[PDB]
Design a protein around this ligand. Structure first.
Ligand code: NAP
Lengths: 498, 498, 498, 498
């Protein structure tokens, strides 16, 4: 019998676990410590949640180790592991309205979007990776033969073993799912640390693993702080791999911690300052629509968001006029209301950071065309913002906002290489985009952009089958696609002589 | 016009460059600083070698950056990149005797072995990877369609950019070749730091890249210390990937340095304590030959060396008798002499370390059945060594000797899981082996061994097509095989809407 | 409303469609023609089934064409096609007892086996290939660049289009499923011709595609004769690919008909005379069990059945003795009786062939140890048969029986190459096996056997992920595995200059 | 010593073998039968060439079989097989001027073009496939486990064995090289039948295999007729695969012959009627240059030649004007003159077919804008020809000319599906192209074209790494690229229980 925080909202009765999930059971943290999770629509406390301690991490890791080494997960057919993950996906789909509602409460995710993305994509992620289980294959290799004898060389793909997954707050369930689906399809067991400010969909997901029949200890979830819980995961002698999504600065620290303990494997999905180049020969109205999506999607809490838009001189003013027209039509409001287009930012500290960000933008001399401020209403809403006359030396040209702030520079008519160079002049390299009807420009620009993803005449078009990851200080390794599997597998080479 | 140290030896004339190699030219280090490289056959000084300084590292990195960004290497077809690397392999082949002689002098490599392995496998490496250049391929992916529009998603495999390669001294030319061939085949440029005590074949190799037509700046070589030169490579903001082979402790430090600067990619080939399990049902005579080889190959200076032999009780004593019989037959002496089959250890410090290692084995109660001492002759020769009665708790059961020291334990007849468990009780996981005529035991044991390579009825059987790399604290990433390319490539996802 | 033949049997009420399945509905053939399907347990008529005519083939092909070119199947995401196929597997699972019972009635499949294999593997097949839909990927290739311009080359994996599948009667549903699953997963539409003698599970499967939501016209099923319906499929100008399983001589004719019409693609899964080589050093009791299975599985109605057993002289007589003891324990009976382990042969004409086969065996000088005859009881049962003293020149050493007939020869102790040569002296090359505890012998024999599948210390171990197909006159192309998809895809190369 | 036809021409003394090449020897045909090969520049007899008889085919096949089964080729490492093929490419490169001259004489290949394409791409093909030999890899597959036991399933990629290669006359050396390089790289041995009219580079190539150290019998070359020699190859019981390139009608007969004998594998590269669609928004002067190349390249003797050009209404007349202007500038003449743009047609009967083809185009109502007749001069020259007002029902709109004949239709501005439908209304499907600056048109058109290759803003851009093959009646299977290997390898599945 599981304890729940019951809540009647959105024409449903929510049943929300709030405890640590260790070894297949929900339990209090050491000393029954708890913390509050805050609803960004009104600032209220949703409920209290267990606050994991070092000793709780050790319990979770030991559970994950036991489940891997002796438990059923390490013994079943790859095909049957997939069946379990495809059942987990079905269970998530049967509970999708509920999960989207929890996500709306916990993270401020507009409910209609959370059904399609926060939850919908999480469901696709498990189904997609479930199909990979019995299709992960090694090789047989035509090695030189030790004549007069013979040789056979094969490789085996094996799990890495116990993994730690540490994620941010922008899409709590989806970031969990991206990494967990891959981790599990490869046959690993896991300890997951959601962002402290957003534990709820992770904990409801935990309960769903029980309904799906995922063996005890395969999935362990520890709400709590990075510096305590996350840190211990990265130092742990029995953890063999860390999957991390977050800031560059925490990413550096995680990699260092992987190094100093046991050279556990690490992959890093870090920040972005993604450029979007819009040429005069694009479809203008479409550029306005995708341009807006590139910045404002999920209230800008989107690591691949276009962090700079470069717009060709001859269409720049008209582009800005049209963006403003469209911005005025966005309906800011409660994420649970069906007419809402723009929900609140995820938490208070981040709202304050966006306010400071835009003050500094104005100070340094950029033109504030609209927004820039907290919306006058309860909770942590921020007004969709547009800046123009942004010059390359400005702080807002360099720094990741992670909010709904469109940052626009001009480039001269016909000036392709010059704008590319401005677009690449950053230590980030997560995403990028180009709008043009011209095939030669589109191909050339996409060769030249120094980013892990290039969108052409679209934006935010990720997919569970398309690998996603950065270059430079945006990190390394992929989430999604076949390529994601390689972060969660080891290759054993076996060489016979006969 | 290049400066050489010239030496008539082994029926040829060695012409050995001795300077740093930067931007296609041989140049003195900052301040014309130099150091001595020492011949382990007689302890003599071979010659003076330039000692790279921080500013030399910066020059080398800048030459590599320019070669990659604006030089010809970043412009030619992948096919033509292949041609250049196939030509470099040819040029190495034309100088095979000279290279192997330099290696005998510099590392004490027995000449006949250096020809086949140190040099022969290096030539194979470049030819293998040259063949990969126009066969490195991305994907097209059946992503969900934004109906009524269409989407196309492809990936492009691109180079990482400037890489640094840091390598040890046991196989100077071969370690360099393993990593450099994969690095260059993937379209990168590189700065290489040979182990300070073994710079000579790296510099000769550098000259050979000129003969081959490799554009200036693509290969740069900096003889110098790990703590100055290697450190700066791992710290440099323009270096994007480090390929490292060496000890676990230095590996941790390299990985930490990569994190703290610019989250440059890293791969790590670290130490081993590889177990070899010998069953009573094996071909015993052949087990003695392969068992001796698993320890003594290349005077034990070999990361995959069997650092522990577990011999089934009923054949143990007979196995020992025969090894002792064969050890007595080994000709220890000058690596250039054709009857030599055991050359000197690589350098004085390491010989000392081996004497100390064997003292500790004796002190702790292991039975020294032969060897254990420096051979009383000039240079740094150490006796082929056999320990028996080795207990799991003993130092020599756990620490990597990196020398010709056979370390033998018994296990009970019919035990399989118990010996596996003892063989797995290490934080190393580089290689391993099993001798048995029994198919079921062979397949089962290779499943259970926690190591990146498992040899069955052979040992030391690496191959340029077979991926090579560790689990646990032996590191991560592969050298050799298709898999090695992945350390040297980035994946860019390109998604169109149309 | 669908018309059914209703039947109360096996504690179920069977609802069996009996008409042509065309464009998503059950319809009568041209002129309402029908034929009888016969129950092999007692020779009775199960029911009347529509008898497809030429005009019915054309209607089916037209419905497949329309569903491919204009219907929903041609438009949905690969991922959603996957979902439809997974759902189809679920529906099959919900009907598994009914499908196994229908197969028991129609093909004489022993019910408990049909549940596990005939039906159970069919379900696995659809789930497996459902997983492939969104993981079928093309390439991007590093072609030479037309400088100063650039080139991009990619490949797209596309459906072949309208396919015909023609299958035999030994595993009616499973042979349908193997090929149909791969065909549909690749995005094609299909016209299926079951063996005329075994139409029933195919017709039920057709109804299940409706339950699962497969768009109309994607699956069309045509009970009828090979010489009429099969022939027209292979001749049809709008069919682009034939997938065929059956005899070598019909295979040859199908291939010829593909040629003479529109060079439609073809794959051919033909007969087998598969050798099983049993060495003295094998586990003898397991060799008996697996040897039993290799011949008698599914009443020998199994294309990969061992059609010759080669037993090493020193264990030959002992092996035969043990086999006879085991054969005597087999319960022959009605496939619905839970204690039955040997059911009747599929249909009468095949029983007749088996009788003639053994007459000729005895005529030519082989020693008939047991069986060889129809069991005296109603239906078409055949007594499990063992021949010894079989010589290489004998008809029964050459020709496929496709019935429960063990055909044993000796080979001299210590021989390997001689027995290999005898095992390879056949124009067949479908499967093969070796039992030995010796690793070197097992690897060597598996190299030298000229067969598409080699079993080692097991037999009949097929798997939906393991490719299955023949060499030489056993055909070409694979069913099962990733490799099966290649028969049902085309590759388009797209090369840009920009 | 080998007998040569000796000829002082093009600054060289050509030494041309003229006999059959069987088992590493140049030998006369049965009864010393010969025929004449004709120089198409002046109609003169170059020399007499042996005319292979059936018994000669049988000797070639026996030599290939023996080379495969017991000779060195079947025993050497894959890597060493690669070396021999690289060395063969080196030898071809050292004889490249000589080979190009021979091709100029035998096929009318313009010398400068022959250096770059006929010969140059042949050299690239051998180098490319040489790199594949040690990178052909099988798989290890995570099959369901027969609990309590374990299973290992692996695949081995194996050669098919003795192959027959039958080719046409348009690029005699290159067609040979495309197929043979892939054939040999996969480890097979081969009998090659060159087009009767063009034996000479094939025979010179044979001698080059000797110089390169390709083991006797691996390559056998039999000049002679398709209906005698080609027939017997396709009928032969020891040939296991035919690789065919030629007409659709012969392809059908070849496929039939493979069926009727021993179901040998077959791949088919058949004809083309390839559409090129040129939109008004293309770069027009470039479209004229590439449009001309698309038809006139290699005097139109090019399977992928654009057999119809669809030109958008608003640019049609200007396009035709420019074409005519550029056509008038083409230098027609002796393929040895360095300024020749247009050589003679390959042989007399083909010239006559081209004269008839143009008669018929005028007769049925097409507008002859220029050319259409034999150039009056010695040899077999045909005028570069342009037709306009071509309509979809016309003979010249459906039939492959295989000559320098531009066949132009208009299509209405702003229709796309309508032009596609016209471009797809053929049973051919070898190649196609689209010229447009619009990315959306380019991508959509490339999806919709029913052709194995789509060129975008280029034409004739084949590459040794890019797979090349038809859909529909243009055949199946690929030459070039990784995908070519699959026609020449078999897959053996090996499954263990342990
Ligand atoms: N897995 C494999 O493929 C493999 C192969 C060969 C060897 N090994 C391992 O190598 C070890 C023995 O070699 P070793 O004792 O020379 O190893 P090491 O001390 O770790 O040195 C390896 C290389 O790293 C350099 N280095 C030292 N400090 C550095 C720093 N702070 N930053 C960057 N580079 C630095 C060294 O420079 P210096 O020359 O100045 O010392 C040397 O070039 C054994 O454990 C052996 O198993 C592993």
């Amino acid at each position: 019998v599981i304890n729940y925080v019951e809540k009647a909202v959105n024409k449903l009765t929510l049943q929300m676990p709030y405890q640590l999930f260790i070894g297949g059971e929900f339990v209090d943290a050491e000393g029954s410590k708890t913390y509050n999770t805050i609803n960004p629509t009104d600032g209220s406390v949703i409920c209290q949640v267990s606050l994991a301690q070092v000793s709780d991490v050790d319990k979770a890791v030991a559970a994950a180790k036991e489940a891997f080494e002796n438990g059923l997960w390490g013994k079943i057919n790859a095909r049957d592991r997939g069946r379990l993950l495809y059942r987990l996906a079905d269970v998530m789909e049967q509970h999708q309205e509920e999960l989207a509602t929890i996500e709306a409460l916990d993270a401020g995710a507009v409910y209609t979007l959370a059904l399609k993305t926060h939850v919908g994509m999480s469901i696709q992620t498990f189904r997609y990776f479930a199909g990979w289980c019995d299709k992960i294959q090694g090789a047989t290799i035509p090695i030189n033969q030790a004549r007069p004898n013979r040789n056979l060389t094969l490789t085996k793909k094996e799990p890495v073993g116990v993994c730690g997954i540490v994620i941010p707050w922008n899409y709590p369930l989806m970031m969990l799912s991206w990494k967990t689906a891959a981790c599990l399809a490869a046959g690993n067991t896991v300890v997951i640390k959601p962002a402290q400010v957003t534990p709820l969909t992770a904990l409801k997901f935990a309960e769903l693993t029980l309904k799906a029949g995922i063996p005890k200890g395969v999935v362990n979830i520890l709400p709590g702080s990075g510096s305590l819980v996350g840190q211990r995961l990265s130092d742990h002698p029995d953890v063999r791999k860390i999957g991390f999504t977050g800031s560059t600065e925490v990413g550096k620290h995680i990699m260092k911690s992987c190094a100093l303990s046991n050279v556990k494997k690490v992959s890093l999905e870090l920040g972005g300052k993604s450029p979007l180049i819009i040429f005069a020969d694009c479809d203008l109205n479409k550029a306005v629509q995708m341009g807006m999506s590139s910045v404002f999607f999920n209230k800008g809490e989107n690591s691949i968001a276009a962090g700079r838009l470069f717009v060709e001189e001859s269409i720049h003013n008209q582009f800005v006029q049209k963006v403003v027209e469209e911005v005025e039509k966005m309906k800011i409001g409660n994420p649970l209301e069906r007419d809402t287009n723009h929900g609140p930012q995820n938490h208070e500290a981040h709202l304050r950071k966006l306010v400071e960000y835009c003050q500094r933008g104005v100070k340094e001399g950029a033109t504030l065309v609209c927004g820039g401020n907290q919306v006058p209403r309860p909770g942590f809403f921020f007004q969709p913002t547009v800046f123009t006359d942004v010059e390359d030396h400005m702080y807002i040209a360099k720094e990741e906002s992670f909010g709904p702030i469109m940052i626009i520079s001009r480039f001269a008519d016909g000036d392709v290489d010059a704008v590319l160079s401005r677009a690449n002049a950053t230590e980030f390299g997560l995403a990028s985009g180009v709008f043009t009807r011209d095939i030669n420009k589109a191909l050339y620009v996409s060769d030249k952009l120094q980013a892990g993803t290039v969108f052409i005449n679209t934006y935010n078009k990720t997919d569970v089958a398309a690998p996603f990851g950065g270059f430079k200080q945006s990190g390394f390794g992929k989430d999604l696609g076949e390529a994601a599997l390689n972060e969660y597998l080891r290759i054993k080479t076996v060489t016979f002589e006969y």
